[PDB]
Design a protein around this nucleic acid. Structure first.
Length: 1326
RNA sequence: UUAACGAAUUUAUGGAUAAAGUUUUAGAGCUAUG
DNA sequence: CAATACCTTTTATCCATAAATTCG
DNA sequence: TTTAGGTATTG
RNA sequence: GUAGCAAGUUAAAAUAAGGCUAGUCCGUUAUCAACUUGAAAAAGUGGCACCGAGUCGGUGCUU
């Protein structure tokens, strides 16, 4: 006796209920709690607002740093351990001094100066080496024994900040000068090639090689500079090799197989000797020279400056930035003193101003500083060498900035290496541990390994060789690198859908190939002259054809089968094959690729080897790393020749299949003794298909399958497995929590129908006209020009693609009056450009039930082709225009018109259908087949979208929140109506497998527009009492039903519930705050009084708790009873939950009433006084309660008043829509009045409302379309939810925030259920 | 995922890295003047 | 108090898997 | 990428 | 304390409090009205028809 309609979105689930005759019911509901209200009537329509679902990504990123920090403090801890023994000899508490660098002198346990204890030597230090970068150069360059404390500072400073690992290989300090390296590259070629010696002459190798151009264009530009040699010639192959390019040297030496050499790819050191051996070892001296140049090129962009004087270019690059800053500061500081010495105090002394004082001491970015002084620079003289420095964006640069990190960790390691090498003679431990220390800088946990856990991390998957602690130096021995790399993918690879306990096999698995061949072979039937009836392929032939034709060639065409097997082996000269199509879709691709390498056809056939051949593909498909493949295959090396193994390691397989090994060959019928595969050959006269095998009740497969699956799962897992946005899953869970409650309301009765629906270029317009009049060559673009912001107007934009001529008439069209000209769809209702055309009269096409007629096509079949070749129309647009010559829109073509429009393509929505449908129909009849009690309809959203505009139910989002229920109601109406009149479409719209045939075009309707039967009158007749033709059921009464629908829309009571949510996540605002004497300053770490060190602020409040107890007041300390709202923060919450009372007493409460403590989540609901509602937004803040029921005449008005997208509809309807504006013109005063009583009743903001009231008074003479739209802003003041700022016309009206929660404490608390219908009300009295 | 194989983008989940920011302290501020 | 005004870490790089989506 | 709750200070 | 002037670019340390399972692990996602039952997962709990409509109001029968 009822039906449910849903409208699912990101932030709301909308829900309404419908009757046989389309009324929405009501019911008296019990009210729990101590309040005198014992009952309420509420309508069975509602919606559920909620905060969006938050993705894990934001969280996961925090995790990356969380590990990034606990691994970096470990790296420095690693250097310190190396020094600990040796350093204590030099400085007893050097490391201690650093640990406590952050403590204030009162809390410091040692000397205040870190690098050296004494005040004198530390000042000398910054005197000589102002930057660490200054020091790095000296530690690299000098030969003098430098203090061990400095060595540590430099080395630890490189290990703390490595730069990035985005390069693999090594770059050298020698390799910066490309020309110096280039000449060696030319030079070696000359010591080897006296028959064709080359001369570098005066080629500019520096400029040509290191350029932002293609790796290809630079190659050509170089050899062009040389006297003329081929890029295919050997020198170019070398030069290409330096360029990050892959060249082939086969052409020069004409080697039997191609051997290319790329410097990024792994296969280079190994590939060299396999190629190098044939030419001989003498050449190799050349190839290393080329590799060196590559390393020269690569860092040619990173370290652009001259680096000839030093082995530490990076620090040298910094030292230059420092001195330039010093130089240019004085010139800037001086030139301001010289000409403008009044602003200098603002510039260099005011921290807050974004001056240099702001740049250094204030919080001002180089982008903010550059901007602020650029005006000053150009008013004083000599400011060119400094202004060119500012446009260069290199002026008064800091050394540590945002653009670094383009630095590759290798150049740091270069300075590290130099420092170690320099000072190892002086310090023995440096020379012993040099390699041990360098690995600290170079080591990176390989991603496939994952976090190195000891079974106590969710994310980890790694495997360990020894249960001992992991360090960068013993990493290979302790960690099973390979078996981790497999576990790495195996945990992300899918499971078998039919048997979800077993792993999916590789897509190129040999067993997968056979199964995939035989499943196509079993359903092949052959008909011959000798035979009366077609017969399935029998057991021998499948096994014959496979041995004969599939092992011999990659793909098997139908002609090969009739010729090679049927005619040759069975001697049938002619035959017809029904089952297979033109060629066999399956192939034995792994067989032949494996057959070619190992070359033992006997080997691939011994079923004893199937275990061994599966393993090679699983290892080959799985693994990326060349070395690790070898480690797995070594066990196989004895079976194989040493040359056979070489090719095996190369072939890699990509992809994962669908089905398990156990499914195909493990599962066995208890009675037949046979597997899935064994039934795929030899299934008797009837050869059964794979689906058929699982779906045969005589076989144990349907019974065995069901055992694995049910062993199924709770709702979360079923919902969470859903693929798609993680917030739209929330609405799903909420939409399904809604349905389960509606059924409870209806006395635990299941409903007949359920309707679910879910909601989801400016310059493009200029370019499709720009180039389409360039190839047309017409002057209609020059004759009248237009702009890039205008073309979102349909009629203007259609003219320009049309070129000023109508496709239906062939004449020049006036630019000024497009209102009289109709926008015409090629196919009667599509509103996109692909199907939109603008002509003076839409009847010129002929019959508006017909395709644009043969009369206009013969006139204009040519003009629309000119537009196609100029991309002024799309192939779909042209093919629907010309379709008149393919007999027009065929019944079978017109069926494709409507059917494609109605069905929902979105995979998520479909899954929602299952979720609902399977949760409803638990009963099964005596047959195996399921009983379809509840019908789950998926409605497209557009249908209702047009229905409201078509039938005067206009939707305005921002006036109100009722439209969420409104769309649910209106999805419920159009849904049940479309299935009442069309049960042939049940299979198309309902998740139900009935079956629907395209053939009809039970005739039903001629008209290609599905949404016609609702219409009382239709633009060219329909009876106002509709009934299905076949059953006689009364489906739609245009007179009777439409009255209730507007009545339901214009209903003033709808249940709107905002889901209550404990707030989770970050403790507090992330920013660090400078020291204060506040008590809201949260400590950063325990030993740090925020008053001395600075701390956090602005804790988020996880939930509020209501505390009724006594507190001490005054020096008198008399105990007086207070009832107030305590904020439990996220940091607090864990501590709170263990012991509430001890925790409460710690915050200052005494004699707390434990029974009465109430935990108040965010968005919790309070009604006080005159029914005004407040939602508790914080322990200390409140939020707006109430939704304003603007009457339907205004909603319908304001949508038409706002004048949405000018007017889209038919022009004759539009005139009365325009007339509706003036007729109801006085409404504007009614709308503004509505708010005033509602403001005073609920909102309590008179301060603001008065500037509102006083603002509307002034703009009375401005047009309605301009005036009404700005009236729409005003509602945001009335909106349920938070106070936010709104602007009328030119005046911004700030928000009214409720910074007291006192009034709540004496109101009645409302606990509402998911629907909003069941409640428990609680009146609060101390 | 398609009546079947490939490719690509996007979103989701996960891993290994990087450079900034912020905070306290260390970089003896001097010279007239109470 | 209740207004009033101000505040809120960001921005890169690479690897893997999966659906869902639009092209072949 | 803007929300909407902490926070301190004023007339 | 004011007026002058010199100066500045760098560094160490922390980067959710913290937790025990002490790992070169983990600590911001999902999930949540209320009441009874539960360690939890979860299960359980709220008569109907009519007339009407400014955020649900009245009446009739059973209860």
């Amino acid at each position: 006796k009822y039906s449910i309609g849903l409208a699912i979105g990101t932030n709301s689930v909308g829900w309404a209920v419908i009757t046989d005759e389309y009324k929405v019911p009501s019911k008296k509901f019990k009210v729990l709690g101590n309040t005198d209200r014992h009952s309420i009537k509420k309508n069975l329509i509602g919606a559920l607002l909620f905060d969006s679902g938050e993705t894990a990504e934001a969280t996961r990123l925090k995790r990356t740093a969380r590990r990034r920090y606990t691994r970096r403090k470990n790296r420095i801890c690693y250097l310190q351990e190396i020094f600990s023994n040796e350093m204590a000899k030099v400085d007893d508490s050097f490391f201690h001094r650093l640990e406590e660098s952050f403590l204030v002198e009162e809390d410091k346990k040692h000397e205040r100066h870190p690098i050296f204890g004494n005040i004198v030597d530390e000042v000398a230090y910054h005197e000589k080496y102002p930057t660490i970068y200054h020091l790095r150069k000296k530690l690299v360059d000098s030969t003098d024994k430098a203090d061990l404390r400095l060595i540590y500072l430099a080395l630890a400073h490189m290990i703390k900040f490595r730069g990035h690992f985005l390069i693999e290989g090594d770059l050298n300090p020698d390799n910066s000068d490309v020309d110096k390296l280039f000449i060696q590259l030319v030079q070696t070629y000359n010591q080897l090639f006296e028959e064709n010696p080359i001369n570098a002459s005066g080629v500019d190798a520096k400029a040509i090689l290191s350029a932002r151009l293609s790796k290809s264009r630079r190659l050509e530009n170089l050899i062009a500079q040389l006297p003329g040699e081929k890029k295919n010639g050997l020198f170019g192959n070398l030069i290409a090799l330096s360029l990050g390019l892959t060249p082939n040297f086969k052409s020069n030496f004409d080697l039997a197989e191609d051997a290319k050499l790329q410097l990024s790819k792994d296969t280079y050191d190994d590939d060299l000797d396999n190629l190098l051996a044939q030419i001989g070892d003498q050449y190799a001296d050349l190839f290393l020279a080329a590799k060196n140049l590559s390393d020269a090129i690569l860092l040619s962009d990173i370290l652009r400056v001259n680096t000839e004087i030093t082995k530490a270019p990076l620090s040298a690059s910094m030292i230059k930035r420092y001195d330039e800053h010093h130089q240019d500061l004085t010139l800037l500081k001086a030139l301001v003193r010289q000409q403008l010495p009044e602003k200098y105090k603002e510039i260099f002394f005011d921290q807050s101003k974004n001056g240099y004082a702001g740049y250094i001491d204030g919080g001002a970015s180089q982008e903010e500083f550059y901007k602020f002084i650029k005006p000053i620079l150009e008013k004083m003289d000599g400011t060119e060498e400094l202004l060119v420095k500012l446009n260069r964006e290199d002026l008064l640069r800091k050394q540590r900035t945002f653009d670094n990190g383009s630095i590759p960790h290798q150049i740091h390691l270069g300075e590290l290496h130099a420092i170690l090498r320099r000072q190892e003679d002086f310090y023995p431990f440096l020379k012993d541990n040099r390699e041990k220390i360098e690995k600290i800088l170079t080591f990176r946990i390989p991603y496939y390994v994952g976090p190195l856990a000891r079974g106590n991390s969710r994310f980890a998957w790694m495997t360990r060789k020894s249960e001992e602690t992991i360090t960068p130096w013993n990493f290979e021995e302790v960690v099973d690198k390979g078996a981790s790399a497999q576990s790495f993918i195996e945990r992300m690879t899918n499971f078998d859908k039919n048997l979800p306990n077993e792993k999916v096999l590789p897509k190129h698995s040999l067993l997968y190939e056979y199964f995939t061949v035989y499943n196509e072979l079993t359903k092949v039937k052959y008909v011959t002259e000798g035979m009366r009836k077609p017969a399935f392929l029998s057991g021998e032939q499948k096994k014959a054809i496979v041995d004969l034709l599939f092992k011999t060639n990659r793909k098997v065409t139908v002609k090969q089968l009739k010729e090679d097997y049927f005619k040759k082996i069975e001697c049938f000269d002619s035959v017809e094959i029904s089952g297979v199509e033109d060629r066999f879709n399956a192939s034995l691709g792994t067989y032949h690729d494996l057959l070619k390498i190992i070359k033992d056809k006997d080997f691939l056939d011994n079923e004893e080897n199937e275990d061994i051949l599966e393993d090679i593909v699983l290892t080959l498909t799985l693994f990326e790393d060349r070395e690790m493949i070898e480690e797995r295959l070594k066990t196989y090396a004895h079976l194989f020749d040493d040359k056979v193994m070489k090719q095996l390691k190369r072939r890699r397989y990509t992809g994962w299949g669908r089905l398990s090994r156990k499914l195909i060959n493990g599962i066995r019928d208890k009675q037949s003794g046979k597997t899935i595969l064994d039934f795929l050959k030899s299934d008797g006269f009837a050869n059964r298909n794979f689906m058929q095998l699982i779906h045969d009740d005589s076989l144990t497969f349907k019974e065995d399958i069901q055992k694995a699956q049910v062993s199924g799962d709770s709702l979360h897992e079923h919902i969470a497995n859903l693929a798609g946005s993680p917030a739209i899953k929330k609405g799903i869970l909420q939409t399904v929590k809604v349905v389960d409650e509606l059924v409870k309301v209806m006395g635990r009765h299941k409903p007949e129908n359920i309707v679910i629906e879910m909601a989801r270029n400016s310059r493009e317009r200029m370019k499709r006209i720009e180039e389409g009049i360039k190839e047309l060559g017409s002057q209609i673009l020059k004759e009248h020009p237009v702009e890039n912001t205008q073309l979102q107007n349909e009629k203007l934009y259609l003219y320009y693609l049309q070129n000023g001529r109508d496709m239906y008439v062939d004449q020049e069209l006036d630019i000024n009056r497009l209102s009289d000209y109709d926008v015409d769809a090629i196919v009667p209702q599509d509103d996109s450009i692909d199907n939109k055309v603008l002509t003076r009269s839409d009847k010129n096409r002929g019959k508006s039930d017909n395709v644009p007629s043969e009369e206009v096509v013969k006139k204009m079949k040519n003009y629309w082709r000119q537009l196609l070749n100029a991309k002024l129309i799309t192939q779909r647009k042209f093919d629907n225009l010309t379709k008149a010559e393919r007999g027009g829109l065929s019944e079978l073509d017109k069926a494709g018109f409507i059917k494609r429009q109605l069905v929902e393509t979105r995979q998520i929505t479909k899954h929602v259908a299952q979720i609902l449908d399977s949760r409803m129909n638990t009963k099964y009849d005596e047959n195996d087949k399921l009983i379809r009690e509840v019908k789950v309809i998926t409605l497209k959203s557009k249908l209702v979208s047009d229905f409201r505009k078509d039938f005067q139910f206009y939707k305005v989002r921002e006036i109100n929140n009722y439209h969420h229920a409104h769309d649910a109601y209106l999805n419920a109406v159009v849904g049940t109506a479309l299935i009442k009149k069309y049960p042939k479409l049940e299979s198309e719209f309902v998740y139900g497998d009935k079956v629907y045939d395209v053939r009809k075009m039970a005739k039903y309707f001629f008209y290609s527009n599905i949404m016609n039967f609702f219409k009382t009158e239709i633009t060219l007749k329909r009876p106002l009492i509709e009934t299905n033709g076949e059953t006689g059921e009364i489906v739609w009464d245009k007179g009777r039903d439409f009255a209730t629908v507007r009545k339901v829309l214009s209903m003033p009571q709808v249940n709107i519930v905002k889901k209550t949510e404990v707030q989770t996540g970050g403790f507090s605002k992330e920013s660090i705050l400078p020291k204060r004497n506040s008590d809201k300053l949260i400590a950063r770490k325990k030993d740090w009084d925020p008053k001395k060190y600075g701390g956090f602020d602005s804790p988020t409040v996880a939930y509020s708790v209501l505390v009724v107890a006594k507190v001490e007041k005054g020096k008198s300390k008399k105990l007086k009873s207070v009832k107030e709202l305590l904020g439990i923060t996220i940091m607090e919450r864990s501590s709170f939950e263990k012991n509430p009372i001890d925790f409460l007493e710690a915050k200052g409460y005494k004699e707390v009433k434990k029974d009465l403590i109430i935990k108040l989540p965010k968005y919790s609901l309070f009604e006080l006084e005159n029914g005004r509602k407040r939602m508790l937004a914080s322990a200390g803040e409140l939020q707006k309660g109430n939704e304003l029921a603007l009457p339907s005449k205004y909603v319908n008005f304001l949508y038409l008043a706002s004048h949405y997208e000018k007017l889209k509809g038919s022009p004759e309807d539009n005139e009365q829509k325009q007339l509706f504006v003036e007729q109801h013109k006085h409404y504007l005063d009614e709308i503004i009045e509505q708010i005033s009583e509602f403001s005073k009743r609920v909102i309590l903001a008179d301060a603001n409302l008065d500037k509102v009231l006083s603002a509307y008074n002034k703009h009375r003479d401005k047009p309605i379309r301009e005036q009404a739209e700005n009236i729409i802003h005003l509602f945001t003041l009335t909106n349920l939810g938070a106070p936010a700022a709104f602007k009328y016309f030119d005046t911004t009206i700030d928000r009214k925030r409720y910074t007291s929660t006192k009034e709540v404490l004496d109101a009645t608390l409302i606990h509402q259920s998911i629907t909003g219908l069941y409640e428990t009300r609680i009146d609060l009295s101390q």
